[PDB]
């Protein structure tokens, strides 16, 4: 917990909310990690 911005509130302040990232490898928006990380965590699933 810090002053960092999650992907989450970025979505809230853009008025997006999780459905619009559809072509982006990210699933859980509330984690603190980069896009590459997100891609490596889900890799065995596809």
């Amino acid at each position: 917990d810090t002053r960092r911005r999650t992907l989450e509130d970025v979505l809230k302040r853009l008025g997006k909310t999780t459905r619009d990232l559809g072509s982006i490898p990210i699933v859980n928006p509330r984690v603190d990690v980069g896009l590459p990380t997100h891609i490596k965590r889900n890799y065995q699933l596809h």
Binding site: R4, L7, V10, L14, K16, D20, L21, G34, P36
Partner: peptide
């Protein structure tokens, strides 16, 4: 994950995510 883009992810996150949704 060791690249420059990630080094930019840690200092300012909001720009990173913003240009990720745009880019």
């Amino acid at each position: 994950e060791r690249s420059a883009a990630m080094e930019e992810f840690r200092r300012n996150s909001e720009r990173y995510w913003r240009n990720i949704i745009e880019g």
